[PDB]
Amino acid sequence: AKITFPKDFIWGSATAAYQIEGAYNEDGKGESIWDRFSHTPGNIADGHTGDVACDHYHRYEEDIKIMKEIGIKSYRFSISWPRIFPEGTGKLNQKGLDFYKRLTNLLLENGIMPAITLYHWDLPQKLQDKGGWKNRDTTDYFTEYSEVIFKNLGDIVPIWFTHNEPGVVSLLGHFLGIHAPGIKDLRTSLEVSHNLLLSHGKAVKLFREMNIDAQIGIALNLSYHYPASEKAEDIEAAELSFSLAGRWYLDPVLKGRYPENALKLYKKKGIELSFPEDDLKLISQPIDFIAFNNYSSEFIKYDPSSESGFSPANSILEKFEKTDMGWIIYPEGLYDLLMLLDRDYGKPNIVISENGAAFKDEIGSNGKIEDTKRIQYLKDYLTQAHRAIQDGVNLKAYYLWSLLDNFEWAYGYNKRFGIVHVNFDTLERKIKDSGYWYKEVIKNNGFLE
């Protein structure tokens, strides 16, 4: 069958500033928590850093030409907070604004709609020295940064995301310690979760008060958490697992409450956190769309003697095909997630702000990257997105992660998600088969399956 998306469907591709830009100490930029984390041996696979990355800071013109060749109609990127306020607050670094004004204007000149993430993990290190996201004041410094950006770009950028994956920043950055800033403390991670969400609400309020003529949302990490069987104890386990993961952020944002099942667990663990009563009313400011980053799905069993009360169903997981990340490939998961969003949250407008896959790429004798498994993944996942649309979900846009191979956080350069290959030694770009496939998808507004 022929899969044709809605006429006005937005086809995009996404990146993040630390992952692509390089120029880590150029034009007055301040140190970020990811600069510090990357420089510390043992934190990144193979001792890789984002010092140079794709060097997009210098090579953006070439990248925009590639975007035009593929025909992406929107580009999702993030702004580096420490390029704008090197110390987090205080003296504005005009050269920072200048880089992003140029970039934005060039995107628009080439007929590519900019879509901007304000926070994609690069907190200024000076703020982390003061306590980082554990410090409520950081939520005000974030709002002050957001104000400058809205003043300079607001009414030429149609789509805005406040945060990218606060639940990852909290969990990996502040409980597991495997992301910047490398903290390991449950209570701190929960205070950080809250302040991230608080800062989202402050920014959205500000955006409305400044009458910016654009749309604003947030990009959450979301997966469907399947129970291991149809037994109520498994169903309840999976529901709890989701409530401690993506729904710990969805419910505050869209319903103005934390999930009750998760609050009971944390109380059972001896954490009963109390924040001003008005914080949830601020967190749940109306947004124009809910966005999410999705790659895979979870399978959860009842596990009553565990600290959590649930665990991964490994016998189910071990049977799926996996990506180079070790993540299960299960395209129907994206359908089930989209239908949950639509059912549980009053049929919101939805954006997939990231979806993609890492596979091992090889340049052939013919000089080409024939990344068939990445194409198959994208086609299977987009087929399910389309099935959701036909079933009434208000899915408006799909941003393919990523335009470029990039610095994959703690994995360094070992994990390639691009539709465009980057040689990290030479900085040469080469469009993969997946990039030319996406070119075709955009031109045909879909594909056969």
Please give the helix or strand (H or E) that residue 259 lies within, else none.
none
Write the CB contacts of 260 (distance below 8 Å, at least 6 apart in sequence).
none
Q: Sign (positive/negative) of CA torsion 310, 316, 320, 326? A: positive
Let me know: does 89 contact 30? Beta carbons within 8 Å: no
Q: How far is CA 159 from the centre of its chain?
A: 14
The span from the CA of 430 to the CA of 423, in Å, is 8
Is 277 exposed, middle or buried, given 0-12, 13-18 or 19+ CB atoms closer than 10 A?
A: exposed
Which listed residue (21, 31, 191, 354) is catalytic?
A: 354
The span from the CA of 379 to the CA of 329, in Å, is 12
In one-letter notation, the amino acid at residue 90 is G
The span from the CA of 15 to the CA of 399, in Å, is 9
The span from the CA of 198 to the CA of 278, in Å, is 10
The span from the CA of 349 to the CA of 48, in Å, is 38
Alpha helices, DSSP H, located in 291-371: 314-317, 332-344
Query: Which residue(s) pair with 300 in the sheet?
Result: 227, 312
**Token pair recorded at residue 420:** 């465009």
Q: In the PDB record, what is the listed experimental method?
A: X-ray
- Give the CA distances from residue 4 to residues 7, 349, 372, 395, 448, in Å, rounded to whole numbers and listed in that order: 9, 19, 21, 14, 9
In one-letter notation, the amino acid at residue 15 is T
- Backbone dihedral region of 402: left (phi > 0), alpha (psi from -120 to 50 degrees) or beta? beta
Helix axes 56-70, 433-444, angle to 10 degrees: 50
Helix axes 56-70, 94-109, angle to 10 degrees: 20
Nearest to 367 by CA among 423, 311, 425: 423
The span from the CA of 161 to the CA of 232, in Å, is 37
The span from the CA of 72 to the CA of 256, in Å, is 35
Residue 110 phi, psi dihedral angles, 5° rounding? -100, 10
The span from the CA of 183 to the CA of 364, in Å, is 43
The span from the CA of 245 to the CA of 219, in Å, is 14
The residue ranges of every structural domain in the chain are: 1-449
Let me know: does 433 contact 372? Beta carbons within 8 Å: yes
Is residue 165 part of the annotated active site? The answer reads yes
Alpha helices, DSSP H, located in 210-255: 232-244, 247-255
Residues comprising the chain, all counted: 449
Assigned CATH class of 1-449? alpha beta
DSSP state of 245: T
Q: How far is CA 327 from the centre of its chain?
A: 16
The span from the CA of 447 to the CA of 444, in Å, is 7
Which listed residue (21, 31, 165, 408) is catalytic?
A: 165
Let me know: does 181 contact 138? Beta carbons within 8 Å: no
β-pairing, 290-293 with 446-448? unpaired
The span from the CA of 385 to the CA of 394, in Å, is 10
- Give the CA distances from residue 3 to residues 297, 305, 329, in Å, rounded to whole numbers and listed in that order: 23, 46, 20
**Token pair recorded at residue 220:** 């959450």
Q: Sign (positive/negative) of CA torsion 140, 141, 142, 144? A: positive
Count CB neighbours of 215 within 10 A.
Answer: 18
Please give the helix or strand (H or E) that residue 195 lies within, else none.
helix 186-209
Query: Which residue(s) pair with 310 in the sheet?
Result: 302
Alpha helices, DSSP H, located in 39-185: 56-70, 81-84, 94-109, 125-129, 137-153, 166-174
The span from the CA of 98 to the CA of 305, in Å, is 56
Nearest to 69 by CA among 440, 444, 445: 440
Helix, strand, or coil here: 26?
Answer: coil
